[PDB]
Amino acid sequence: NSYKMDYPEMGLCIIINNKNFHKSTGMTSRSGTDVDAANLRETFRNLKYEVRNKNDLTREEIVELMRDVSKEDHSKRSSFVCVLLSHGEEGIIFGTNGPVDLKKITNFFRGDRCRSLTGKPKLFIIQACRGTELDCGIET
Template sequence: MLLICQQSHHFSSFFRGSSIASYDYVELCASLPIYITVTLCSLYVYRLDYPSIGQCIIINNKNFDRGTVSKEDHSCAASFVCVLLSHGDEGVFFGTDGSVELKYLTSLFRGDRCRSLVGKPKLFFIQACRGTDLDAGIETDSADDETTRIPVEADFLYAYSTAPGYYSWRNTMTGSWFMQSLCDMVTKYGKELELLHIMTRVNHKVAVEFESISNAPGFNAKKQIPCIVSMLTKEMYFTP
């Protein structure tokens, strides 16, 4: 597991609360089981009966070699998880020394570039703005062993903190709305629900339970909805 928590960069100084969110995620990772046994049909469920789920790496984004992790041998790991917390724009993630396209970063882990992750879930959780639009909200009434060719882009999941083009909110005291909700829902339902079901509950929690409070003109009473893009080909459970 790779965790990139970028608390500051040269594009903006407004990113308080990231250290809180990253701490919560590390605590969550520590609580997840290291050894997994899956009893459901392997045709529709990712195998997690590897020696370990993976590893958690907290790094300094300024000194990050983008190709390092993708070149490592992940043969003994069941999955790859990357958590990114920083500023951003649509398709772009900001670092201390410049910006990088998310498409380039994630492409390093495609099946044709990282063979040891072929057929395994590659999950990216991205806490960053995707634009400057604000959501004002609206009232509502209430496997087998046979060799199979698969696309190089298969088995990815991208969980964005907000919809395309929109601002991503965070509280200076408690961290980002998205990361709070993600940690809460995985902690609460990680032993019983499939990953996409958990992410649906994350979406609901962010959409219903959070609303901005700000004295800045135009920034008060705004909402947010995460965006989940799945190219997973099987279900993923954390159940031991």
């Protein structure tokens, strides 16, 4: 048994692509992220999503846009996709001016807080660091 995917629309795809960071953070500019953002745009267009690209948002702007997007009526949509491209730590992504908790962004879409997405797949795709450990690997 599987999710109903034949609503009138597949849903939103929100791509938040943060490349350039305030000197206050001491985070370096994420060269190459623009290629990822473009590639995700065509990928999810071809999957019949309504794709919105956002670039270099502060943490305040990330919170505002995600709360806004959670207040829209998704009744005609099958799903929701959010793609975050930024620096991060465990449980954290970076706005251009600092960290936000992942939970802060996703809690907007909880089954009880976004009622037009209850019962529907909510995908978050996070390209960001989850800490500083390094995987040496092993020869097969």
